[PDB]
Amino acid sequence: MNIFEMLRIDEGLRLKIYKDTEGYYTIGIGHLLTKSPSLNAAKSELDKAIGRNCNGVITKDEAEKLFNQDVDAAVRGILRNAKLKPVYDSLDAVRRCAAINQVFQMGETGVAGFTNSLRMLQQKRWDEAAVNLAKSRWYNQTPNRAKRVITTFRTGTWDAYK
Ligand SMILES: [Cl-]
Ligand SMILES: [Cl-]
């Protein structure tokens, strides 16, 4: 198991513009296009990202390309973040994937606000962090996935991903 396979599992793969769980236009492997409700704005953003007239649809390769850039962007965002970096570097590899997951889903921003949990993770208080993490909008709105990530952080193994 690795980050790509993990996220591919959590985000799915769709080749036509779609609405995510929050109702926003997205495409591919969870690639958010825009928060605007204008489909058109979405198509535009799509073409600009891909570099061609897409008409709302892309290929697998295109999707995968966006996914690579996106994983990469997330790691980098973590590294550049002063609140995040230290936590991240203190964790083992599996758990690192779990942090990337969250960041990919909610942004550097959001994760940066999980102050208490962050500290717990840094101190290696797994069970504790896990309970904390569940007291959040994040878990409440997308509980099966959040459960998987949380278990990942809790255990340091890939069992949630079976
Ligand atoms: Cl792009
Ligand atoms: Cl879910």
Structure description:
Its EC number is 3.2.1.17. The active site is at residues 11, 20. Keywords: Antimicrobial, Bacteriolytic enzyme, Cytolysis, Glycosidase, Host cell lysis by virus, Host cytoplasm, Hydrolase, Viral release from host cell. Belongs to the glycosyl hydrolase 24 family. The chain has helices at residues 3-11, 39-50, 60-80, 84-90, 93-112, 115-123, 126-134, 137-141, 143-155, and strands at 14-19, 25-28, 31-34. With 162 residues, the protein is mainly α. The chain has one domain: Lysozyme. Strands 1-2-3 form a 3-stranded antiparallel sheet. α4 (84-90) packs parallel to α6, α5 packs across α9 (143-155) and α7 (126-134) packs antiparallel against α9 (143-155). It is elongated and about 50 Å long. The chain starts with a helix and ends in a 7-residue tail after the last helix.
